[PDB]
């Protein structure tokens, strides 16, 4: 199976959440996503097929994981923009408040937005997650875990939460009422030495 960022993945084949970005661990393949999304071990499946599993993970307190990818599958060093294309990811350089991003996932596909504010902790049921930045481009239960990226294609990081509404999102409001939360992928590269795949 093809792993691109955005695309629905299943975990333990009971939830769903989004992948992040393909990333490379020297020979082993892997994508990270959000840690709130899988145990350590929780068997991920893609396009009807497992294709790995959560490898390590860091929730609450962080949020992020890798999961490592079956060498039969190939890695897209893109994100999914959910009309039939992709975004090519070209780094990680980070984006500074004010600037435009975008994320891509399975429940609202496509959407674009502005970093906000930064090092935002989110109070969730499960404790605190630290450090998060926050955007409002809209998203909605089922879009953790994928990709948030400027659109010259610098990963910025990975679906962590924000204030959805009874409806599961937070896209029937404006932006300007959104708080959106994203993990810095930075962080996750370099504690598991991962590398973004490219192109």
Excluded at 5 to 32: D, H, M, P, Q
Excluded at 73 to 85: E, F, M, R
Excluded at 147 to 161: I, P
Aim: hydrophobic share 35%.
């Amino acid at each position: 199976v093809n792993v691109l960022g955005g695309i629905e993945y299943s975990i333990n084949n009971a939830t769903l959440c989004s992948v992040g970005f393909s990333v490379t661990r020297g020979a082993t393949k892997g994508f990270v996503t959000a840690g709130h999304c899988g145990g350590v071990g929780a068997i991920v499946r893609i396009g009807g097929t497992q294709v790995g599993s959560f490898a390590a993970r860091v929730f609450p307190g962080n949020d992020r994981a890798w999961v490592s990818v079956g060498s039969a599958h190939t890695l897209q060093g893109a994100v999914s923009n959910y009309s039939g294309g992709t975004i090519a990811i070209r780094g990680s350089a980070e984006a500074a408040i004010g600037a435009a991003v975008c994320r891509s996932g399975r429940t609202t596909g496509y959407r674009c937005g502005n970093i906000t504010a930064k090092n935002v902790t989110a109070n969730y049921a499960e404790g605190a997650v630290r450090g998060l930045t926050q955007g409002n481009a809209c998203m909605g239960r089922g879009d953790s875990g994928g990709s948030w990226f400027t659109s010259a294609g610098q990963a910025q990081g990975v679906m962590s939460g924000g204030n959805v509404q009874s409806n599961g999102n937070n896209c029937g409001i404006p932006a300007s009422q959104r708080s959106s939360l994203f993990e810095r992928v930075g962080p996750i590269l370099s504690q598991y030495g991962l590398s973004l795949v490219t192109s």
